Amino acid sequence: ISKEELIKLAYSIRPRENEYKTILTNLDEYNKLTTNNNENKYLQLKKLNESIDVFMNKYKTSSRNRALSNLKKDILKEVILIKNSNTSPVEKNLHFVWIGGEVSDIALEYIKQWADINAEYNIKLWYDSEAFLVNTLKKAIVESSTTEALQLLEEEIQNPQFDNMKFYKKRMEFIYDRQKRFINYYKSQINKPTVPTIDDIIKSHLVSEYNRDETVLESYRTNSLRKINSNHGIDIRANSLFTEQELLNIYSQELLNRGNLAAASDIVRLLALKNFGGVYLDVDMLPGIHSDLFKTISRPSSIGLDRWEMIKLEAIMKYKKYINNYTSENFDKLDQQLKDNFKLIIESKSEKSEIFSKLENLNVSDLEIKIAFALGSVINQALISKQGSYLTNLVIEQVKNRYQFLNQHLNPAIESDNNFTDTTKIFHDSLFNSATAENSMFLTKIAPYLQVGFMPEARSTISLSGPGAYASAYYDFINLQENTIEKTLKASDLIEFKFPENNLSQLTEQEINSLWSFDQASAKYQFEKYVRDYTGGSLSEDNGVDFNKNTALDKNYLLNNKIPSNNVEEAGSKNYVHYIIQLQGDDISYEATCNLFSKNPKNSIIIQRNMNESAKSYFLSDDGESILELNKYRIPERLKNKEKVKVTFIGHGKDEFNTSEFARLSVDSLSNEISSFLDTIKLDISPKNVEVNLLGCNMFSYDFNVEETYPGKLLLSIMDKITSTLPDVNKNSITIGANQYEVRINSEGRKELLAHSGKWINKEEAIMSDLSSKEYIFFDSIDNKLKAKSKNIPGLASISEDIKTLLLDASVSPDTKFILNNLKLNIESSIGDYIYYEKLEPVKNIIHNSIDDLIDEFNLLENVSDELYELKKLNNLDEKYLISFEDISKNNSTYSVRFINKSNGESVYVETEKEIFSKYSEHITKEISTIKNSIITDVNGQLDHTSQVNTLNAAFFIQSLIDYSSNKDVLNDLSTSVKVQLYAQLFSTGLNTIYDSIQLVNLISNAVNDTINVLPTITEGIPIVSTILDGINLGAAIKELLDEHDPLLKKELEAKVGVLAINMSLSIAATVASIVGIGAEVTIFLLPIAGISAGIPSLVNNELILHDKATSVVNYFNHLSESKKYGPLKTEDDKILVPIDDLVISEIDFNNNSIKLGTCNILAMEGGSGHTVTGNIDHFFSSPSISSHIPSLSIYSAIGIETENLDFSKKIMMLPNAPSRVFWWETGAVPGLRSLENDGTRLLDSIRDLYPGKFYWRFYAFFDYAITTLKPVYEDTNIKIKLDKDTRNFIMPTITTNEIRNKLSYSFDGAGGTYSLLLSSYPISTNINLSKDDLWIFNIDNEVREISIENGTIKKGKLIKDVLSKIDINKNKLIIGNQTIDFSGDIDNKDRYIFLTCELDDKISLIIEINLVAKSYSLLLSGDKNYLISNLSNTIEKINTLGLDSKNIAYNYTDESNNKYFGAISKTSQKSIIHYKKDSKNILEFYNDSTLEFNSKDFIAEDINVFMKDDINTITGKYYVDNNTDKSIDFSISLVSKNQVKVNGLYLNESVYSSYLDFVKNSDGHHNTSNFMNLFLDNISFWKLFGFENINFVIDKYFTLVGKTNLGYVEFICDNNKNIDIYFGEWKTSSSKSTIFSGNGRNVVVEPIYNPDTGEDISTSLDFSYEPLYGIDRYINKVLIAPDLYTSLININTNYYSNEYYPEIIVLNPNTFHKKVNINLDSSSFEYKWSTEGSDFILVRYLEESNKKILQKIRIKGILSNTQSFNKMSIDFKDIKKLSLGYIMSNFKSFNS
């Protein structure tokens, strides 16, 4: 009913197809106008359905096919809706048919029951008034012909070994010739213009050529015309039933030519319902009984279901009568309590009115026709149909087409007047020349058409005017097709056409007898009566030989005749014990017991029960050569463990149709004997099942109603009496077989027969018929009724194969040829019925094989998919309704499925009775649980993936479901539902635990758009070894470290997993080299503190006084002048530029070579009275210095300032320690010191001269006055430092007084160079402007160590604890106690780092690699290798002393002459590896403390990487085998001892893995373990990459190997014990991929490659060959090829003869829209044999090449399940192409299994 939905629901990248446009048009026109009624609605979707097929077959690879096949599923639903729509009562008519003669009084009483209860309806019994002597004629011909055949073979008949078929054949020859005489006599009296009625011509023919009288015959016509008319009679010739001539011809063909009144009746049935209302019944039917009549009565477990329905009818008629002599025989016996109960419940009702049910008004459709059922198949004993009902026409259309085919071949055969023998030979040859694959079974079913009704085992009526035509017409209506010959019916579709059970009452005394088929079983006794009447004779089948001569076993005869001269060997498994029991003392049963024992003398025993007292169980001993004896019916020891109990009772039987007495034992008489023998057996064996054989004359296995028939009556008695005696015997695993003969194979190879004659004779037809007639009856699994297990399919084939070779040769009777041919066809027809009736159940292995588990999963998915689609369709759910399998609740009667709305986050619940969702729920949650519980551990978490052992199996199916829901793909809905469920389970609680709408939407969204990989996919390079440590898989983490290329993210990972990978880049080695060298230079030479030269101020009462005396002040100006005369900076030791002490430097400019000076001032004075100067001495009258309200004087301005063009050649420089300031000062009475001459006095005079009347420091004013003190006030200043690209080294001045220090602040401006700054013990504010984030080194020597001042200089001491225990890092600011370095001009440069350095030792340097952005740091050591290793124990101690927390320490050092050293150290355990390249060859050393625990003077490898983590070290790299570039090996290596080296895992490329596979091929010693993998390294000479030869590697438990074939990869794992096995393998060909994974067993799953982009065309082929299985063929159990909808071709290349073992290839049978699917084998048709194990078909190829036996088995699952699946298949060979499986069963040799 999909309208606009289908389009856009079925998209393909291709433009809209032409035929698809037709579908859309037809799909619309069915929805555009849906006006009632139904017949038009049916034909329209029939157009649509056909329209789809036209497309789906033209564009097989189109992406629209999946959704169009969905529509067809919906269209099939539509046909059902249309049918059960128009529910209106059917017309009021009952139809019965009696044609050919006089209606029996029995029938009339049956019909009278309906007319009385259903007075509403009026019975219109049909009859052919022109033909009342047809039945009278058939008898006349049969009787006359029977007598003719008897006289023809009168001599032959007296022979006991005379097959009764030569009679029936010779008779049929006479029947036919006598029939033609009538047909010709008829043809000669119809052409005449005067028209004589049919039985009028019959009357003339009977009295002429036969001994009849017209007066008698005409009397039989009169009283059969009034009798039929009085009893609701209506003529067929008087009403226009045969308005169509084609039907009258068919009817007349069955009425006149062949004496088939039954087949003629079938034609009248259909037409009566085509013209009138539809309720048809037979004369053996009865009205339905009320379901309340026997409601209170329980059903004994002694009688069958069918018999229970019989006795209910029988209980009525015994008193209520309604029948003259109704037989209540089965009801009479032994239950008086229930016999009295039935009487009252019937006597307590109104007479006849309420005894049965009433049809009332039966509502049927204008289309449908309802037919009665019988044991799962349709039968036309009851019919219901609207007039001209659509299906009623289909049955008629069927019948016509059946006869159209029949007569097309039969008429030309019949036309040429030949005898029966040659007429049939023409017909058969005519049939199987037009034979196809679709009508093959129909042909063999209509081949004995002429013989029908005159020869046994010939039933063509069924396939022409019988149930076969009905069933075919049903399939026609259901699947919207026309003219189906023989296609399967599913009982789930038959139910809606089933006749209402409350009205049937099918089982009746007459109906039971009408079901007795005309077989060779009944032909046995009917023939006997013919001879019994022809001659006054006697019984011979028992009489004549049946004696009491109880001969005991001749041990010599049984050992040196029977056992050795036996030629019969059975292929069935010998796990069984056989109880051959002789019941009678004739010489016939004796010779039989000795022969049956000879077949398997080591499994069977002999018990001559015929001797009641001396009944001992003879058998062959544990050894041969003698027959040991043993009383008490028991068995030897070796036959006690047997699973199967086989028992054969040998004895003669009563000469009666359906015998009731076997060997003078009644039904209940043998049961008491079986019970009084079974108890004696229980002490030796407790079997799982039992098989009861009954051998002897007149012992057949009947077709219908085996219940109420020996030994069907016997199985009931034994069943409950054997299941309580022998435990472990399934309630229904009890088979019983009735055989008549015993067969041997003589010295020439011909099957022989032990008849009552007492001699073994060659009666082929008797033997072959008996072997094929035998059946095994058991109890139904559903406890329903008694069913017969299907015969051995390769068995019946083996029989027909024997028949063919008999028919092939010329030395065999034409009489026997004819019968064996009819037998062959009957056998061939039987095999075909098993596929048509769906009687073949799937294989149930004794043990749950691993391959079956897979098959049950693929099948499970297909069911849950379709059932979900049907569930969502019935309940109208869009694409926004996600099913929650976690929420399949179970109400009282139905389940309750939750559907989460993906849009609003709400959920809706729907109820279904289907338990498929419930079961898939349990399985899918279990799998998901297995996945989550494989992602350990709990503490750390989001990918971990610590997969192991079996957990891959769950991971496979889930991952295969996840990937189906590829991003931005619509279907399947199921695929996403599991993906969401899994997602919710991994990152949240259960999906069933989430009710929040907003949460659900966001979850489902993220679940869909993210990608989850629960399945490990193999990659090139180092394999991931699952070695758990500290909650992290180190092997997994390492693999990421090799693959992560962003050096930062690589460092980020190292910080997380606590793993240190060593760096070998020469860029880092050089960087470190420059850094360590700078620190060493700067930290060694000691320098003075500020300020020993200028003088350190001493605070006194809230003001700073720099100097006390005038002499001290002059000295300051002396120092100040001395300074700026040598320049603003001083050079010392030709190493460092030091500024003048207390000289205010405001700005240093390196790239321009200039300096800015700050403000250094001194207060001015004012207003002197009298000024004179005499001899450099000023005289005054007290000029006061302001204190202070007057402008300041510049001290520096008077000094020789020299700013520009300085020599900044030196890289090392001391930082200025002088803040800008203004000097407060006063004068004091100072005597003497006149004409004191210093460079400061001159400078002081330079201030005096430059500043007239503003400054005077020494003067006379009635007293000698001079500048007494000098007290400064510091204003905080900033020293901006402008750098160049050149490298600059800086030292921070150590300032004692806090007042001076706090005023200072530094500002650096980078320029892409190397800058270093030695930190002072006393913190000075600093800020750095990062340009290019160039090299910035910081020596923390003075802040990490203990510091004190000696004679004005700094002395570094011991290290202070916990200094670096607290380090603060930010992109804008770095804090290391005590200094705080701010960072401005911050380029957010992720790349470049910051370095901290200090000297732990004279030669050992520590380096801290810091990233501002990353907010973290790393540790590094530099120095001499040998010296470090020695002092390692205590230098690692130093690092812990400082407070550094880094778990691992890197080692980088460049030596003199430029040779570099690399390595890493673990802070704990003190283990370290060191690598370097001396003389171009690689050298690595493994150290533990000061001990060398491994060495390698030469290490041949590339891409070398060293990893450190606690005790564990890992070395990766690529190695070349035998120095060959193609031979590439990637290795994971752990160093442990001086000699032994641990191997973690290996990777092998195509060339090396081929060397491995070849090594593995010849590896089997046959068994030397565990030195296997150690031996491969010996072959590869893996030691040769190391230096020395004497090495022993160790293979870890978690060792992981991986090789690369040209199709994929295979990853091996070492098991619990050291055993190598396949963990996970995956290779893809052009069309498909194969997957093998640890858990599912050792199987390979072949799946078609799924392309994500759906729109593009899909592949329609699968490819398999044994070639990818080379070398690893020992690791593989079986191969499972699993195709999908888009698969029609399976290419299997079977000519790869390089493997010893070939896995069984199992091909699954999925549903497909394709018409045909093919398996193309690249081998010949011969070399192949076929077999059958349950539902699946088997082809096995045997070939002998290179002195090697080759057996290639191929099993196609469940093909024989139904006709639909059986005809999908075709098989291609190199010689013959396109072969049906039916053809293969016919032209290939079969074999048992």
Interface segment toward Zn ion; rule CB under 5 A; list 157-165, 312-320, 540-548, 1568-1576: 540-548
Kindly report the backbone phi and psi dihedral angles of residue 1772, in degrees, each rounded to the nearest multiple of 5, phi listed first.
Answer: -100, 135
The least distance separating Zn ion from the CB of residue 545, rounded to whole angstroms, comes to 8
If binding means CB under 5 A, how many residues of this protein chain bind Zn ion?
3
Q: Residue 267 annotated as binding?
A: yes
Q: Residue 1386 annotated as binding?
A: no
| Residue (697 or 1552) nearer to Zn ion, CB | 697
Q: Residue 104 annotated as binding?
A: no
Question: Would you call 652 a catalytic residue per the annotation?
Answer: yes
Q: Residue 548 annotated as binding?
A: yes
The least distance separating Zn ion from the CB of residue 541, rounded to whole angstroms, comes to 5
| Residue (382 or 588) nearer to Zn ion, CB | 588
Are the C-beta atoms of residues 877 and 900 closer than 8 Å to each other?
A: no
State which of positions 681-700 bind Zn ion (CB under 5 A): 697
Q: Residue 791 annotated as binding?
A: yes
State both tokens at 1558: 């070849």
468-501 burial, b at 16+ Cβ within 10 Å, e below that, comes to bbbbbbbbbbbbbeeebbbbbbeeeebeebebee
The least distance separating Zn ion from the CB of residue 535, rounded to whole angstroms, comes to 21
Is 652 a binding residue for Zn ion by CB under 5 A? The answer is yes
| Residue (587 or 1727) nearer to Zn ion, CB | 587
- Round to whole Å and give the CA distance between 1768 and 1491: 75
The least distance separating Zn ion from the CB of residue 701, rounded to whole angstroms, comes to 17
In whole angstroms, what separates CA 402 from the centre of its chain?
A: 45
* Rounded CA Rg of the chain: 55
Q: Residue 599 annotated as binding?
A: yes
Neighbours of 246 (CB within 10 A): 12
1382-1399 burial, b at 16+ Cβ within 10 Å, e below that, comes to bbeebeebeeebbbbbbb
Are the C-beta atoms of residues 570 and 1791 closer than 8 Å to each other?
A: no
What single letter denotes the amino acid at residue 774?
K
The least distance separating Zn ion from the CB of residue 699, rounded to whole angstroms, comes to 9
| Residue (511 or 542) nearer to Zn ion, CB | 542
| Residue (452 or 754) nearer to Zn ion, CB | 754
State both tokens at 857: 């999963």
Q: Quick one: 1727 exposed, middle or buried, by C-beta within 10 A (0-12, 13-18, 19+)?
A: middle
- Contacts of 58 by beta carbon, 8 Å cutoff, 6+ apart: 19
Interface segment toward Zn ion; rule CB under 5 A; list 534-542, 1065-1073, 1541-1549, 1633-1641: 534-542
Q: Residue 514 annotated as binding?
A: yes
Reply yes or no: is the peptide bond before residue 1091 cis, omega within 30 of 0: yes
Are the C-beta atoms of residues 1389 and 1333 closer than 8 Å to each other?
A: yes
Q: Residue 576 annotated as binding?
A: yes
Q: Residue 980 annotated as binding?
A: no
In the three-class reduction of DSSP (H, G, I as helix; E, B as strand; rest coil), residue 1357 is classed as strand
| Residue (542 or 1142) nearer to Zn ion, CB | 542
| Residue (259 or 653) nearer to Zn ion, CB | 653
The least distance separating Zn ion from the CB of residue 651, rounded to whole angstroms, comes to 8
Q: Which of 95, 428, 697, 1714 is labelled catalytic?
A: 697
The least distance separating Zn ion from the CB of residue 377, rounded to whole angstroms, comes to 35
Interface segment toward Zn ion; rule CB under 5 A; list 129-137, 647-655, 800-808, 1369-1377: 647-655
Q: What is the DSSP letter of 633?
A: T
The least distance separating Zn ion from the CB of residue 661, rounded to whole angstroms, comes to 12
Are the C-beta atoms of residues 293 and 344 closer than 8 Å to each other?
A: no
Interface segment toward Zn ion; rule CB under 5 A; list 538-546, 678-686, 1127-1135, 1623-1631: 538-546
Are the C-beta atoms of residues 884 and 907 closer than 8 Å to each other?
A: yes
Interface segment toward Zn ion; rule CB under 5 A; list 132-140, 645-653, 1062-1070, 1734-1742: 645-653
Are the C-beta atoms of residues 392 and 377 closer than 8 Å to each other?
A: no
Q: Which of 652, 1107, 1475, 1714 is labelled catalytic?
A: 652
Q: Scanning the structure block, which residue is given the tokens 């032959």?
A: 156
| Residue (588 or 690) nearer to Zn ion, CB | 588
- Round to whole Å and give the CA distance between 1739 and 1784: 10
State which of positions 173-212 bind Zn ion (CB under 5 A): none
To 10 degrees, what angle do helices 18-32 and 38-58 make? 160
In whole angstroms, what separates CA 711 from the centre of its chain?
A: 46
The least distance separating Zn ion from the CB of residue 702, rounded to whole angstroms, comes to 19
Q: Residue 283 annotated as binding?
A: yes
Q: Residue 774 annotated as binding?
A: yes
The least distance separating Zn ion from the CB of residue 756, rounded to whole angstroms, comes to 5
Minimal CB distance to Zn ion: which residue?
Answer: 652
Question: Would you call 1614 a catalytic residue per the annotation?
Answer: no
Q: Residue 139 annotated as binding?
A: no
| Residue (405 or 662) nearer to Zn ion, CB | 662
Reply yes or no: is the peptide bond before residue 350 cis, omega within 30 of 0: no
Q: Quick one: 153 exposed, middle or buried, by C-beta within 10 A (0-12, 13-18, 19+)?
A: middle
| Residue (656 or 1700) nearer to Zn ion, CB | 656
130-146 burial, b at 16+ Cβ within 10 Å, e below that, comes to bbbbbbbbbebbbeebb
| Residue (130 or 542) nearer to Zn ion, CB | 542
- Letters for 695-734 (x = contact with Zn ion by CB under 5 A, - = none) are --x-------------------------------------
Interface segment toward Zn ion; rule CB under 5 A; list 60-68, 650-658, 910-918, 1217-1225: 650-658
Angle, CA 976 vertex, CA 974 and CA 982 arms, to 5°: 105
Q: Output the DSSP codes for 878-921.
A: -TTEEEEEEEEEE-SSSEEEEEEETTTS-EEEEEE---HHHHHH
Is 542 a binding residue for Zn ion by CB under 5 A? The answer is yes
Q: Residue 646 annotated as binding?
A: yes
What are the Cα distances from residue 949, in Å, to 168, 938, 952, 1621? Answer: 70, 20, 7, 11
The least distance separating Zn ion from the CB of residue 739, rounded to whole angstroms, comes to 13
Q: Residue 652 annotated as binding?
A: yes
Is 663 a binding residue for Zn ion by CB under 5 A? The answer is no
Q: Residue 268 annotated as binding?
A: yes
What single letter denotes the amino acid at residue 420?
F
- Round to whole Å and give the CA distance between 576 and 691: 10
Is 487 a binding residue for Zn ion by CB under 5 A? The answer is no
| Residue (586 or 1626) nearer to Zn ion, CB | 586
State both tokens at 1492: 């060398």
Are the C-beta atoms of residues 1716 and 1685 closer than 8 Å to each other?
A: no
The least distance separating Zn ion from the CB of residue 711, rounded to whole angstroms, comes to 16
**Torsion sign across C-alpha atoms 514, 835, 785, 498:** negative
Binding site for Zn(2+): what residues are annotated? 541-542, 652, 756
- The catalytic residue positions are 652, 697
Binding site for UDP-alpha-D-glucose: what residues are annotated? 97-99, 135, 265-269, 282-284, 514-516
Binding site: what residues are annotated? 97-99, 135, 265-269, 282-284, 511, 514-516, 541-542, 548, 576, 599, 646, 652, 750-751, 756, 763, 774, 791
Binding site for Mn(2+): what residues are annotated? 282, 284, 511
Interface residues toward Zn ion, by CB under 5 A: 542, 652, 697
